[PDB]
Amino acid sequence: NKTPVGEVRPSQLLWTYGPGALIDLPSLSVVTLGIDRWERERCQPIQEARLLAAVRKVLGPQVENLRMPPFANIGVPVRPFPRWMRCVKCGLLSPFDDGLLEIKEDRFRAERTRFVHKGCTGSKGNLPAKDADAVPARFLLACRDGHLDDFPWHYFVHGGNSTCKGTLRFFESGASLQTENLWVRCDSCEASRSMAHAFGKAGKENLPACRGRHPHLDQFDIDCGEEPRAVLLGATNSWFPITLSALAIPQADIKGPEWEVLTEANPPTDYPHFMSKKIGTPAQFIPYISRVLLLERLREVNALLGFTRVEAPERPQMASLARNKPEWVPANQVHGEGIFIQFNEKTLVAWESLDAVKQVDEMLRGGHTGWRNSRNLDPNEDYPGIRYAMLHTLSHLLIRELALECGYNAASIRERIYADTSNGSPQAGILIYTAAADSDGTLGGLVDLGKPENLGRLLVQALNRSKICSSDPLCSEHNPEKDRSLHAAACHACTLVAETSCEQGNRYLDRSLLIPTLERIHAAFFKGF
Amino acid sequence: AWIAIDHNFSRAQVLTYYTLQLKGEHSLHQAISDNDWILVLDTTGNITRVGRILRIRSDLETTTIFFDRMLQVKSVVSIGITPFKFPPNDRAGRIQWTDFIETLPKELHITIADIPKIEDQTYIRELLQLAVMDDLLGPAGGPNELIVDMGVRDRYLVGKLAPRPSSLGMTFCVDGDVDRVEIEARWGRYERVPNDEHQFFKSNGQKAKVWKRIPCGGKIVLPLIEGSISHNAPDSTSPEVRVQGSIRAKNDNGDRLITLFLVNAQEEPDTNRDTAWVFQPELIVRAAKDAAKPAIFRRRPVLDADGMDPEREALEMIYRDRVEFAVGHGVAVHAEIADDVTLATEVRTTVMPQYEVQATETPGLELSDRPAMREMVSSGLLDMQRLATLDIDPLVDALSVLTNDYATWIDEQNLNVSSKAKGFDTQAQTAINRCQEIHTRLQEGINTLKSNENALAAFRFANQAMATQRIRSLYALAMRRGEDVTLDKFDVLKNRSWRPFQLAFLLLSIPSLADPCHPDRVKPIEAYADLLWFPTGGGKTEAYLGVAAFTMAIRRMQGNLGGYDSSRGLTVIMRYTLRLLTLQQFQRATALICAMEVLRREALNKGDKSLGTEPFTIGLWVGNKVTPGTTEDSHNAIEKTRNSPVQLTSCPWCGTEIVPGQDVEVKKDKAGGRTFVYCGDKKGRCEFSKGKSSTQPHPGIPVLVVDEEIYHRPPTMMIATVDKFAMMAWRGQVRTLFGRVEKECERHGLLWPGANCTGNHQAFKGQPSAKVKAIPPIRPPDLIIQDEFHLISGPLGTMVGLYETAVDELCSWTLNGKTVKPKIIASTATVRKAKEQVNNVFMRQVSVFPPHGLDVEDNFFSVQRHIKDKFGRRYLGVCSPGSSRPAMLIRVYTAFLTAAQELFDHFGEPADPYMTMVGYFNSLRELGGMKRLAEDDVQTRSYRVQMSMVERPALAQRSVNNIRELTSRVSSQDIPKYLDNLEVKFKAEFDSSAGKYVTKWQEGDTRAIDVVLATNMLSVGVDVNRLGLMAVNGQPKGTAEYIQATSRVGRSFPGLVCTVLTWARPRDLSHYETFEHYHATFYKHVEAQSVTPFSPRAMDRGLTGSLLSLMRLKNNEFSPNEGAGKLDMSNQSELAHAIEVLATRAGNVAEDNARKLLAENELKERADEWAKEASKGGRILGYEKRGPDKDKTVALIKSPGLQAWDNWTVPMSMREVESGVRLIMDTKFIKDDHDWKP
DNA sequence: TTTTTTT
Ligand SMILES: Nc1ncnc2c1ncn2[C@@H]1O[C@H](COP(=O)(O)OP(=O)(O)O)[C@@H](O)[C@H]1O
């Protein structure tokens, strides 16, 4: 019945691939099944009650444990997707379950396993009958509400419902330079159509309605009201996760007690995974920075709670992991080390009263109000503030400078920003730590940079480079109120990082709040650097 | 047939050989086309050159014509003997064809078939670059080209500005003396052509779409006043294009910063949107026409931030003659340099940049080098064979020449501090001193060689062994490839001479090894560890193998000093980090071992017993997945072979094949055995054959592969991986390799506690009885060599350094009350912050050889050649914002594959190095993703490249069939044949019916390879001469790896490297904006590294392992598995010694007592946990679960796994790897009950 | 049942 295909590292199972995603294996592609078909008793539980109290609060009081990914027939169950494939030699297009395709496999060397077209005789049927290699189709249909399905070739090639049952062909449209032109040809009705008609606004006239399929759960919904979309195979906008995390502290919001513990005059040292040092402060940054704390033993846990398909999460758009309300959710833990930086209160309170800061805050609030009303949400809520944007920009610049100077890998370092000001206990600080247990600098390589002779270097070299962007004139002139954007003066070329590291997902960013740019000057926080 | 007049309008001599340049537009020269003969005369009417046209390029005022066949007329021939007229107004003119045909043999004595062809490869490497550049950037046809049947957006890949990225700019610094500058901008524009003016049809008669190109551009003049730059439009016909920027205030030096931009401001129309785009832009800045001095551009500001470093200041000192003048914002820059190297005259932007790197050599062959090196080369003073026969006084006379000229060079370099090092006098003196130090050590080495006689004997022995191995390796290689040669051919002076820095390193390393009482090895402070650095390709490996040979030879002549044996045992330990690297190093070391054995065997026959009776051997110590761990497995592999103990494929001494099932013998093993490997010579003339070596103590090839056979009879040399050294805390029989032995068995060898044999045997199978004998111990080894030292950093280098505490301790021995320590030699390609690294891992003082000098180009041993005299390796950059990576990769691969065929069809076999193409990839997932695109889309686009109506000028038709993927999935049997698969060239014969070269393949022949792909390392086994073209996917994670990887191509032929850089990644874009400066100053940019042991996170993992490793091997009571539970008060006093040595090294390395207190507390904690468990009664306490007593035995330590990490978990490898999870497929058929609907 | 590459 079952057969192995391949293997991956288990750190990916909560960030890339996982339930409902398309795994691009070297020979084919699969979709991971839901967690209700997983081996419950081969998943080692992980103990963290503080994260459990929030997971229960979001997904209901029936959740029991947080469990690790499992470890000859033991593994992660998958199922092939998409089901329509194309033969290379003859160009024939047929679904797998019609019988014309058969599988060649080895149960001891399962990396070589791939599909072949059984008894190929060529396009004209003159070649000898031999198995020939085949390639999966390169187009899919996506829905906003969460549904995924194969491309409807039969509906598209005949312009509607049809009677014909003949074979289909694929072509490269003759010319070499063209990737935009592709042809689908019917062998029996002799009709043809182009793949260019399914994109742009032309897709609304031609493409049919959504069906409501969940490939990982193997179910069909009754009805769907969303307009479908044509999407390439392996696109970046196909799967986004929903994650929640917390830190292990000695002993109701998650971030509250962490800020309480980290700002104590004497940090505790009795817990086995908590040890801190108090190494100085650079001489150029005396008035701004009040305390730098280096952490040499730190522990973090994570969780996976759901996913969405086309757009990033802001909850009607979340897709469940099981048919019922699930009893357990996956988990992951990493032992690492971090650096904490605290800023001066009075310098921030004085800087908030300048006029240009109020102008930029009004512009960003207008852009936020424009952005929330386009999706029928309440526009009078969820503004983090202007201090959040300032700290969030400084964090991204520092993380980029870490990779530019020391030669680190990009996805090795995560971030965490403390900026609440509404509960009478104002917060100001960022936290930078390692992402995985096998990344760069895990053996004391990050606490090395926490000395006063290196952190000031890093900050100066970060602030000097950010003065001119590579698309500078139109970048500084960008107005978030006109186009309902949630960012200003921060494009891909000067601010943003990989999707693993960011906490909010590349929102609320403004480099003019830090240093004087070409159009805002008086709104800066660091002067003369 | 056209006429022309020579004027020499170009400077590049290689191009002026093969090209002709004519002024004016090509519209005045439209009648000249391809395949037309031309004739060139000078300004006085003398016939000079004849050529055949290959290709025509054109510009706004000049045209460039290329050739493929050319002949030069040497004689002074007047035009007046020919009936042809003088060329009027220096223009073209038609020549009579029949008169030309009659005149060619009559006066020039040549015919059409007598014209030769161009053979240079630097011309081909330029033609290929032009062919790719025309397709990727444009314009393909010319200034007024036409584009048929396709949109103009997708025809080109790079260099286009969209209407409302849309802008480009650059930054530069200007002098404060001038006040006006000049700015020039140019671009291109395309316009739709109406139907009634063009007659291009489809196949069915319909009209096609045709666009036409029109040039633009204009100049402005700009005064410098502080403030923003006023908007200006260079061209009146397009008033919505802008140049803008800002001008800043003065600095402390008195210069100004100027920032520029070029912005497209056009609007988007509803139809024909491609008319609003701007194509092929560029900017040029120059001084004004009436200005006094042209050079006004100066150095970009340093931007100091209060930091000092002697190495950084020295690096700024050496690279002072290459200056960065500008930076780019989205486009690379290029600057022209005046007669003063600090001043620049023009700056301009370049969409795709190119730069060529100078090559490094060892001097002695050219006429312009120093007289002493040429005298040494010409007089044969570098010959290895000659140096072993001279007397002591001619030997010192020959060796003094290497030091006298070095002292003269040091004296010459001292005068230039005041003149040519202004601003850097202190660093100049600091660099001057170390050359005098090196000269002092060279004279010390010569003095040591003068007084001692054992050193002289060892020196002669090493010279002879190196010469013999050097000569015989080439004969073995030639014999393995089926060549019919004899040994007489390879005995020449050319193949048996030194290179000067190898001999200098040998003379450096002599005094520390000849006498153990030297101050280098007997005191803990100021001990030198010799770091050797050089460009890749110089003989570093042959340099330290000679040191290993000298170390081996001298040890047997010193006698048994200090109550230790010296006639046998391990001497040299060599270690690596890559398992494959050890496999190619072993094959190199075996030839030297064989040569030493052959010398020793001949020495004993004559009656000279100085070398001893024990033979020289060599072993491999790598993981059990490669080598058998027990002789039963060695028997089982051979038994399964006839119906792995063989790492050798061919005999190192004669090159004969090896049959695994016949040439391997395993002796029967009641308790232990020996494995032998014999040469495959059936006729029986090799010295390692079965008919000759049966009498020797170690018959056959002297190699040891099995772990137990190594443990019972230790070898002279060991080649191992670093990760195998972590197994000391698991197995206690490793102590034999460090010389902790007391007993020996006549039948089997050295013994350890817990072994099978006890030394007492009765008579059995006719063999006599024997009894256990006692023996004095053996001296620990002398020399440790660590290669690829730059890879020893980060998390790997931390655990290499932490586990080096025990290794540095266990080779110590006492001589006359002092403590003797081993010499450490390291080798690397780069150097950056080496002092802290070497002090951290090795705890030594560093010494770098050779020193810098006052220049990058010139020191005494390395000479950097000029582009005029020797070619270099050209780099080229490609980048496009917003484009997907596969869309770039397909276009690049197709362009290169198709242009290579076009160069093949006209030239022939010299196009071979660019014919196969090598690709480097950063990740396995991207390699697998590209593998499917290479089979399907690249082949399709390569097969359809000249059967559409779109004109592609320089590409040609090729078929792509053979793709290989060189990675970790290949068995080692075909890997030498895969390397020999790449040796076959593209066979081609001239087809006279078509007039071109075509590859015809015979019946069942071996086809060549078209595309080969590579993972993070290349195959790096041999220096195959064929490969000369390479493409890199993205910038690698380190600078040293980048210099290493792209240096593997173009070693015997001109090379070409092309880097595809993304736009989203920070490092790729940052390297794109500074492409020209980064590739001119390589060593300035090596990224920082750190080695931090005794940090808490390393102490939770490695501390218990290092403590147990030190405790087990040094004592006898704790050696075996039953050693646990013997910890009691009478034996507790020997653990404090190990705790104290760990704490002493921690305190010395960290140089901070705050680390030492923590280390002491953590060691005391582990000691008191050990003391609790050993005192538990009613059980047998052991290290592991093993033996018949396992039903009552409880283990003490654990292996890493599913459980949580604790104090007693001991790792089994240096690097931590997280185990993966597998996927299970559920193949089944699915029915559908739901239907589509509108 | 132990040794290592690679994101
Ligand atoms: N004494 C010598 N004479 C001539 N060529 C030499 C000599 N020593 C080394 N070589 C050349 O050096 C090459 C090997 O260089 P190698 O020592 O492997 O460089 P690396 O520093 O990377 O180890 C060989 O191809 C060989 O031709």
Torsion angle in degrees (nearest 10) through CA of B290, B295, B296, B299: 170
- Are B330 and A470 inside 8 Å of each other by CB? yes
**Which residues precede gaps in chain A, with C-N > 2.5 A?**
71, 251, 314
B788 closest CA partner among B432, B536, B587: B536
Helix and strand counts by DSSP (H, E) for chain B: 25, 47
Residues facing residue B2 across a β-bridge = B38, B94
Give contacts of B1216 with chain A, Cβ < 8 Å.
437-438
HEC profile of B9-68: CCCCHHHHHHEEEEECCHHHHCCCCCCCEEEEECCCCEEEEEEEEEEEEECCCEEEEEEE
Stated as kind and residue range, the H or E segment containing A103 is strand A101-104
What are A459's two structure tokens? 């900050």
Q: Is B35 left (phi over 0), alpha (psi -120 to 50) or beta?
A: left
Burial class (CB in 10 A: 0-12, 13-18, 19+), B609: exposed
Sheet hosting strand A139-142, strand order edge to edge:
A148-150, A139-142, A229-232
Angstrom distance (rounded) from CA B66 to CA B52 = 8
Angstrom distance (rounded) from CA A334 to CA B1019 = 36
User: CA B1038 – C1' C6 distance (Å)?
Assistant: 14
- Are B1096 and A444 inside 8 Å of each other by CB? yes
**Radius of gyration in angstroms for the set of CA atoms belonging to chain A, rounded to a whole number:** 27
Give the Å distances, CA to CA, from B677 to B55, B698, B707.
62, 10, 16
User: What residue has token string 């130090």?
Assistant: B437
Distance, CA B538 to ligand 1 centroid (Å)? 6
Q: Is residue A397 part of a domain?
A: no
Q: Is residue A423 part of a domain?
A: no
Stated as kind and residue range, the H or E segment containing B279 is strand B278-287
Is residue B832's beta carbon less than 7 angstroms from any atom in nucleic acid strand C? no
Q: Identify the residue whose C-alpha is closest to ligand 1 atom 4.
A: B495
CB-based contact B852:B318 (threshold 8 Å): yes
DSSP B458: H
Angstrom distance (rounded) from CA B586 to CA B387 = 28
What are B525's two structure tokens? 């402070």
Q: Count other C-beta atoms under 10 Å from residue B1132's C-beta.
A: 13
User: What residue has token string 């996506």?
Assistant: A142
Q: Which nucleotide is nearest to B921 (CA to C1')?
A: C6
Domain coverage including residue A219: 115-232
B657 closest CA partner among B857, B916, B438, B482: B482
B678 closest CA partner among B664, B694, B657: B664
- Are B305 and A448 inside 8 Å of each other by CB? no
User: What residue has token string 């051979």?
Assistant: B638
Query: Which residues 966 to 985 of B reach strand C, CB within 7 A?
Result: 967-968
Distance, CA A28 to ligand 1 centroid (Å)? 46
Angstrom distance (rounded) from CA A61 to CA A38 = 21
Angstrom distance (rounded) from CA B130 to CA B976 = 37
B534 closest CA partner among B249, B743, B831, B275: B831
DSSP B497: B
Could you tell me how many residues make up chain A? 529
Burial class (CB in 10 A: 0-12, 13-18, 19+), A110: middle
CB-based contact B185:B218 (threshold 8 Å): yes
Q: Count other C-beta atoms under 10 Å from residue B677's C-beta.
A: 22
Query: Which residues 893 to 952 of B reach strand C, CB within 7 A?
Result: 922-925
Torsion angle in degrees (nearest 10) through CA of B278, B282, B288, B294: 180
What are B396's two structure tokens? 């010192």
How far separated are the first and last CA of chain B, in Å rounded? 69
What are B156's two structure tokens? 């080109």
Is residue A438's beta carbon less than 7 angstroms from any atom in nucleic acid strand C? yes
Residues facing residue B961 across a β-bridge = none
Q: Is residue A63 part of a domain?
A: no
B373 closest CA partner among B512, B497, B525, B244: B497
Task: Collect all residues with Cβ–Cβ distance below 8 Å to B877 and sequence separation of at least 6.
Answer: B332, B352, B353, B354, B1058, B1059, B1061, B1072, B1075
Backbone angles phi, psi at A297, to 5 degrees: -145, 115
CB-based contact B902:B858 (threshold 8 Å): no
CB-based contact B726:B621 (threshold 8 Å): no
Is residue B1015's beta carbon less than 7 angstroms from any atom in nucleic acid strand C? yes
Distance, CA B499 to ligand 1 centroid (Å)? 10
A247 closest CA partner among A236, A239, A256, A258: A258
Angstrom distance (rounded) from CA A282 to CA A292 = 10
DSSP B515: -
| Chain A interface mutation, best of B1221, B1227, B1229, B1232, highest count of A Cβ atoms under 10 Å | B1221
Q: Is residue A225 part of a domain?
A: yes
- Written as one string, the DSSP assignment of B313-376 is HHHHHHTTTS---EEEESSEEEEEE-SSTT-EEEEEEESS-EEEE--EE-SSSSTTS-HHHHHH
CB-based contact B981:B1019 (threshold 8 Å): no
Largest CA-CA distance found in chain B, in angstroms, rounded:
120
Domain count within chain A:
1
Burial class (CB in 10 A: 0-12, 13-18, 19+), A85: buried
| Chain B interface mutation, best of A237, A278, A443, A476, highest count of B Cβ atoms under 10 Å | A443
User: What 3-state DSSP class applies to A327?
Assistant: coil
Give the Å distances, CA to CA, from A230 to A95, A150, A207, A233.
19, 10, 9, 10
Handedness of CA A314, A320, A325, A330 (dihedral sign): negative
Alpha carbon B990 to its chain's center: 38
- Written as one string, the DSSP assignment of B197-221 is G---B-TTS-B--EEEEEE--EEEE
Q: Which nucleotide is nearest to B1015 (CA to C1')?
A: C6
DSSP A372: H
Is residue B1018's beta carbon less than 7 angstroms from any atom in nucleic acid strand C? no
Distance, CA B445 to ligand 1 centroid (Å)? 24
Could you tell me how many residues make up chain B? 1238
Q: Is the CB of B576 under 6 A from ligand 1?
A: no
Burial string for B109-128 (b: 16+ CB within 10 Å, else e) reads eeeeeebeebeebebbbbbb
Angstrom distance (rounded) from CA A30 to CA A215 = 10
Kindly report the bases of strand C lying within 7 A of a protein C-beta atom: 2-7
- Are A440 and B795 inside 8 Å of each other by CB? yes
Give the determination technique: cryo-EM
State the nearest residue by CA to the C1' of C2: B624
B58 closest CA partner among B94, B33, B88: B33
Q: In B1048-1134, which residue ranges form alpha helices assigned H by DSSP?
A: 1066-1073, 1075-1078, 1096-1114
Q: Where are the beta strands (DSSP E) in B773-861?
A: 773-774, 783-787, 813-815, 818-820, 823-828, 845-849
* Planar angle of CA B393, B399, B403, nearest 5 degrees: 130
Q: Is residue A56 part of a domain?
A: no
What are A274's two structure tokens? 């908590």
For residue B534, give the ligand 1 atom closest to its CA: 21
Angstrom distance (rounded) from CA A448 to CA A454 = 8
| Chain A interface mutation, best of B800, B1016, B1224, B1235, highest count of A Cβ atoms under 10 Å | B1224
In the chain, the amino acid numbered B602 is E
Residue of A nearest to B940 (CA): A176
Q: Count other C-beta atoms under 10 Å from residue A69's C-beta.
A: 19
HEC profile of B74-100: CCCCEHHHCCCCCCHHHCCCECCHHHH
Give contacts of A176 with chain B, Cβ < 8 Å.
894, 940-941, 944-945, 948, 950
Handedness of CA A165, A169, A170, A171 (dihedral sign): negative
What are B144's two structure tokens? 């007024």
Backbone angles phi, psi at B105, to 5 degrees: -85, -20
Angstrom distance (rounded) from CA B917 to CA B904 = 14
B810 closest CA partner among B725, B906, B699: B725
- In CATH terms, the superfamily for domain B867-1085 is P-loop containing nucleotide triphosphate hydrolases (3.40.50.300)
A133 closest CA partner among A118, A123, A151: A118
CB-based contact B710:B617 (threshold 8 Å): no
What are B43's two structure tokens? 């300004």
Task: Collect all residues with Cβ–Cβ distance below 8 Å to B1009 and sequence separation of at least 6.
Answer: B916, B962, B963, B964, B981, B982
- Written as one string, the DSSP assignment of B563-609 is T-B-SSS--EEEEES-HHHHHHHHHHHHHHHHHHHHHHHHHHHTT--
Residue of A nearest to B1069 (CA): A493
Angstrom distance (rounded) from CA A398 to CA A400 = 5
Residue of B nearest to A177 (CA): B155
Distance, CA B322 to ligand 1 centroid (Å)? 31
User: What 3-state DSSP class applies to A93?
Assistant: strand
DSSP A191: -
Give the Å distances, CA to CA, from B312 to A323, B309, B530, B857, B1043.
63, 5, 21, 18, 20
**Which residues precede gaps in chain B, with C-N > 2.5 A?**
164, 643
User: What 3-state DSSP class applies to A345?
Assistant: helix
A48 touching chain B per CB within 8 A = no
State the nearest residue by CA to the C1' of C3: B623
How far separated are the first and last CA of chain A, in Å rounded? 66
Q: Identify the residue whose C-alpha is closest to ligand 1 atom 14.
A: B539
Angstrom distance (rounded) from CA A75 to CA A39 = 9
CB-based contact B529:B825 (threshold 8 Å): yes
Residues facing residue A120 across a β-bridge = A130
Q: Is the CB of B1025 under 6 A from ligand 1?
A: no
Q: Where are the beta strands (DSSP E) in A322-480?
A: 328-343, 413-418, 429-434
Contacts 24+ apart (CB under 8 A), A347-351: A347/A287, A347/A288, A348/A387, A348/A428, A351/A525
Angstrom distance (rounded) from CA A469 to CA B327 = 12
Q: Is the CB of B536 under 6 A from ligand 1?
A: yes
